[model samples]
Target: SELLVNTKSGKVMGTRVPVLSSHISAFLGIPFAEPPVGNMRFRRPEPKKPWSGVWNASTYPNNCQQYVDEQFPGFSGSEMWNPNREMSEDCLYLNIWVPSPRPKSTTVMVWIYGGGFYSGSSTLDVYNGKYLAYTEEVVLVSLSYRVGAFGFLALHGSQEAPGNVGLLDQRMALQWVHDNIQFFGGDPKTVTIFGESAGGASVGMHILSPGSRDLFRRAILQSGSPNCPWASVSVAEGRRRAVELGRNLNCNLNSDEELIHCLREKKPQELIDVEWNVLPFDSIFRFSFVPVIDGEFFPTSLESMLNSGNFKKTQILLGVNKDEGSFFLLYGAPGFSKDSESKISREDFMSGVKLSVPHANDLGLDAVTLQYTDWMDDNNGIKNRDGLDDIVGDHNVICPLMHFVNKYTKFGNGTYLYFFNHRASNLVWPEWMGVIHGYEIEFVFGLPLVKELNYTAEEEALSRRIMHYWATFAKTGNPNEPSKWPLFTTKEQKFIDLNTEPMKVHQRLRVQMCVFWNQFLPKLLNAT
Candidate 1:
């Protein structure tokens, strides 16, 4: 049971996970970078110094300071996503779950957690990679990045906070794994980077960014993409938000350096608490602080990146859950978080439509509204709520999946797609909330293999099967192993519906909805 692995930084002692998987050793919290504290705050992460003794990697690492996600007791909700560990600014650590009797060569899979680029951790119990690493026979790794203002404070004249350091932190972690994964019996050339929601957006950024193209060979984006609404704010907007944050926090100084210094002097929580006050969300498309076209990492907008054929040509597995919008609606309209089935009224739906599509005039709004309206139903409240969910999902997530598939297929033929429609138990959320955001992550990580959650036989089996598809893609850059899972092409639009058994291949998922959002609506908006 001696699980001592030598990293570039030093020797680390991991433990044999008992009963979880056969001979899987978990290297819990290994530092890849120096603590981003003191003067290093909001700056790019520095490589960690080498250590002398065997570093104890028994306990989970500290999560980066973030909004404490509230989890009510006895509620079927997102408890697994909460950072149920210590929090700190000194939180740049990576965890590894390696199969023992180290295989001669294995695919290394790296996970980037999603928090809308605001909060997430590598220590969540659901993210424990024993089942996937052992069952899929791959070396699994997860890394933490700075979230919120601590991670993505874009400044204009100051070199201290050039912005998008959260993504830079992810890049640093990939570099570390690229260099050292071979030591853990992982093949350096076969690395696959995967994530969900904002994590998916992070993966998409890496695909288009020159700084991260060489780090991984394959990508799996779940319900998020580089061009997704709220994925980024312009650098100009970012600078304005930073300056506004300074003013709100009473650090209105003449020099950028002095303002940054004053910001650093304040408590970390104060800066985070003041973040939304300065950079509030205005639309479904906008966010506070996310990745920016810093002229370094992104180099330009994803729009230009795709149009000019500047993205990495690699194997891609992109997907969206059935009802990504439903989960987000619960957040925007809080009535849905209860035990009973929650809902929105016709009035709420109309107001939301106006706010979400502010550019739409009377005619344009009618066109948009009529597109999503459920003419088959008579009840105004439920019907409109369903329409709202469809609109949100189509506009925010599903269309992004289509955009990635359509754009990448034009460059590389190695693109695979899936439509996850399974809803596991639906005990926590209302039954109507179908496959909401991040619902597939548990299935992806093989959480059902542990039998902790009362997943159905179908769900557990799907979990195992999906883990196979993911790991297979990571190994060979294609998920089609036995079954001839059709490749997604520009003309041949094929995707597997990950809901039922025998998994019949589906053609053209939400054909009209995707078209309206990606093609027709843009033309409509520009018509006037």
Candidate 2:
């Protein structure tokens, strides 16, 4: 049944806004700013003016400009977010899902999607808040923002136009949430800004941003952390990359006006199609569009800022799957494929690792590789160096994550961490895709409610337990009881490892590998 309820019109710059009814109450998406086309293309997000009458919001606004055709491996074309959905410059509207009759104190959870800061929409099927809001009794929120060159290109010309439009859009969305969630029967004070991947990285920046200080109460970071570059990039290297992007775009570096004009005139999708390799793992070699370490919106590197202890406090539940980079391996996993010799060369792979860690001696390589191989050997019970490079990339990304989590634990705030190791690999490639990247998202979102993962009785039970634990943490701050899990403080130093069984928190069995990798992260980030 279509549930229709009463709603009030919130005027913004003479635009009529309609608030949709929940099983109980209504929601309004007040336009925050004018179209981000023409002059305002790469600038800070602006607030919309007051409106006159009621505006219809039954339909969601168009997705901000982004790469719409980046294919997902499992899902077919029809399953993809319609690649032909009309793109727009005037795409700053937010969607709200609320309960009927307006509850006085419902929780708010805001979601930000991730695609290396280049792709994603607020209105994806995976993010539909109907089940989340109705079932959980929470005011779930999601919004679209600028993406790609329009949203993230950091060239000098783009900077002169506007820097970090994507991040600024996020800040504005939170502002909208802060101001409007209560009207939808949700508490603004209880808002939890949560997201996965790039969204997770954005949440990290949001937590640290002074402008976003009092906007959220708690945060849930899934599969991405402050350790990510788009979440925080060094200014010096960013300047260099901006120069390169400008050069590639055929914009005159010497003429900022010409470069800005050239970028402004290009179609959003045309720009999105430019084949560019993402160097997220190669922190030593910067080559991607992301948030810059601009002193205003994003004051400093989120990692350094968090480590230096100069940010506000909030409870965070952070975790990653056992094989956080399995997707990369599966698509790019060489040795396991049908055509073997055509796969990536070991020497070539080693060269990339050499780029990542130029000064690593044999000991460093051994410690890192041992941690990588141990999982495949122990969990899947296999031994082969054919695709150990993928494992190295996983470690390089996750070790920094673990290193930061260790530092974040020092804050003495409520911080809970977990590792997903429930399901075995899909058996498509190697037997070693153990609990691959994004494996935990489905479990947390209660995707199993609609479709089971062919789980056994024990696995099914564990999934239920994990889901409840996540929901409990979202509702409250604690995911553990007195003896069930450790608080991850300085001395105890234990991390909760979740598998088929409920076990107590223990120290990471392989800390030496992490120490070796993390010890050199700063040097890597600063090196040319």
Candidate 3:
């Protein structure tokens, strides 16, 4: 059945997607900003002015321009995860799914897709919110934002191309949601912003951003945090990269005006194609364009903001997957492959560390190696690979995330933490791979509802519980209604264990190891 909802832009026609018990009315391609093409490209997005008639919103929107990898290993991602839609420059719109027969105004959960700050799509089938909406009795939203060079390119003094417009696009979308969700029978104040990986990185920035801190009531970060090494490059580095990009494309390097003008005149794909040429090294620090501490969005350093407790104070839920490295290892390390079972030597393990700890000097490398070494198994290749996995996962996701949460919990009390340890029973990857970076997402989004895969009864049950937990959190500031999840005070230091069987609440997840990464490692390097 076709359904109609009145937004300020216009009345939109949406189609009903039936779930098991109820149905979801999904509206697609609702433009929040003008098509950011020509002069509008690289500038902060401007709102799309409304026209008189009902918008043809039943059609899906074009995905933001991104480099799509045609081939992906089974363990890394799926064909379903790729953007199953057309890609174009005019891709600033929101896709909303509203559950049928809400007894009252419902809570809202807005999603940001993850792609290492360069590539991702909410239009992917896995990210669709129909089942989640009916299960949670909430409204779910996904929006498109610029990525790659188009999103993060920063010049020193160009008002037209100020840095961090990708984030600006996010802030603008949140503003649109806040101002308009009420019209669709959703509570503006009860919105919960959540994401995983680069998506998680975006959420963390939004939580800390002066411009976006107050847009949403509560937040959830799955795996990544803004403070992570990969989330940003320095503004100076960014400007240098920008000039280098223009230079490669035959533009004048000395003139920011000429550089911007020359780059703007060229095609989008031409710019995206040349971004890799700017980087001189072959390491995990491969992305030439990423978030920067611009004077406006960041205002101060992430460290300064974190230390002074100057960031937003919202009820926060966050966690990392237990074995968060294996999937990433396929891409970042040489010895590792799509089939991860091959025996990895100590030398191979050592090589993997440098890729993740690219800036870490010899002293830091030795310290990292010493810290993760197993005294019990001194000469085992298996243990060495385990150490490699631990190091890669820790440096990228676990340690940086724990570092942020520790500071976050210090200032605000409404912090809940979890460690995802369960591996999906029906995974295509080998059993040893455990829960990689985004493994928890399938259950969180309730993929079992559609039975897309052969999900076991236990897996389906766990998925339902996870959705309820997420829904209850959006409804209130807490996830305690369905289950009594304890607060993660710096004192109590408790976190729930999300896994099979009885859910466990443990204290101090990898405290000693994380302390080495977050606190002692830097000083140790300086002393060396």
Candidate 4:
């Protein structure tokens, strides 16, 4: 079935994708911005020009160029997460799925893919919008933006190669939606942006960005925050790494202009091939290319932005999994491997924490060690690397996320929090891994319908609940219409527990440990 929709760029024809019970009108591979190649490389994306006639948007386009390591262990490469689409430099496209016989009050959701700011594409099967679109009777969208050095490389003093083009690409896509979504029966003013990992951090970053403030009305940040260690870097450090990348590519480094030109002239694969060692303090982050405080988009620190009340006042649904760090331990840590014969020892666990958190001194390390001794002890006979995953989860993802949510709630913003503790019964990872990072994406997106994934009746119900909640939140600022999810405040830190049996609303989640990490640890560091 061919459906025509008029957008600012011209008319596009969409095809129908049959979902479980209904069908959705899917408009795929619609260019939202001009191709960022040649002279436009590393620059902010420009809005695409109008097409001559009705264009076919029924086929998917090439995704942004990214390296995929299939041999790497434990959830790496295109087969596992990233979409195995044709890669190209000209990949600034977006996809839309709207329910047919459009509803009068249609809400919209714009998804941004996550790959640590290095990899990923919106065309991943997991991001298929048919299920969510039909289930919620709202329009769903996902967009592809540049990644890696091409997207994030920052030259501190040069305006030509300014950083955060990836973010700029996202903003352009949102702008496209704002200008043209009404034609597709969507409410531009009632849009929600949601993502996971680096994508989640991007949502937080957009909330603080002046340019993107008016774009989205609601946000759902899953398992990542602006406060995450890997989300930001100093401009000086970014420039240093950018220079190293240029040198690795054999570019003339004497003049920034000449160097940038030389680098741009080189093939995309040539730039992608250069592998640089991770900065010592950045071992846990493991990527040289990341968002930097380029003084234009991020004029000040995230803390300063929040404290000064400079961020957009939008409702947020913020949360993390119980074992968000388990994935890192399985892939990032040296002593541990997917097929390791034995569990990580106590010494290995302590060393791993030290490597991840380079700023923690001996005193602070001792305190952390004592706190997690029950999980770290080798004699505890615990499974899943003898509680190493637990410690890693707390230090890296959980505490930082909680700290961010707490501070964000002080501004009297509508905040809804959740603890994802439901582990899929047919999970590929070990049971000891618990509900690991990004596991909830399937439930939220109803990915089982898109892939060959299986779920129990109870899990299916839970997925329905999550989708309903998310869609309702997008429709209304409050997610409590179908359910009674309370707003989180400085005094009352209420959160919903997303689990197998039933959703339970709790006042506080890990309050004791969060206090030590968020408040006590910072005070201790300053005192020394």
Candidates in order, TM-scores: namely 0.95, 0.81, 0.95, 0.93
TM-score of 3: 0.95
Among all candidates shown, the one with the greatest lDDT: 1
List candidate 4 stretches off by more than 4 Å. 72-78, 275-282, 340-342, 360-364, 375-386, 448-452, 523-528
Kindly list the per-residue Cα lDDT of model 3 for residues 1-528, writing each as its tens digit: 337767787777787777775666888888899888998878878988976777777778998888777556343455656667898888998988887753257899999988887787878867878878888889999887888887888874688777888888888889989988887778898899998988898999998898897889889999999898788877888888888888889897667777887888988888877777876455663467788888778878999899899888878888999888876676668777665674567777777777768777898888888887776775677777778888878888898898899899889859889998888877776655668778888888888766657788888998888898888887887887834679898988899998767977888888888888888987887777
Assess candidate 3 and give its lDDT: 0.82
How far residue 383's Cα lies from its native spot in candidate 1, in Å, is 1.7
**What is the per-residue lDDT of model 4 for residues 363-441, given as tens digits with 9 covering 90 to 100?**
8877777766764434553543645676666666678788778777777468999998998877876766679788898
Shift in Å, residue 274, candidate 4: 2.7
TM-score of 1: 0.95
Q: Supply every candidate's count of residue pairs whose N, Cα or C atoms clash at under 3 angstroms.
A: 1, 21, 0, 0
Q: Which of 2 and 4 is ahead in TM-score?
A: 4
Ranking of candidates on lDDT, top first: 1, 3, 4, 2
RMSD of 4: 2.5
**Global lDDT scores for all candidate models:** 0.83, 0.61, 0.82, 0.80
C-alpha RMSD of each candidate structure in angstroms = 2.0, 5.3, 2.0, 2.5
User: Which structure is stronger by lDDT: 1 or 4?
Assistant: 1
For residue 143, model 3's alpha carbon misses the true position, in angstroms, by 1.6
Using lDDT as the measure, name the better of candidate 1 and candidate 2.
1
Looking at candidate 2, the ten consecutive residues that score lowest on lDDT are: 11-20
- Model 3: how far residue 447 lies from native, Å: 0.2
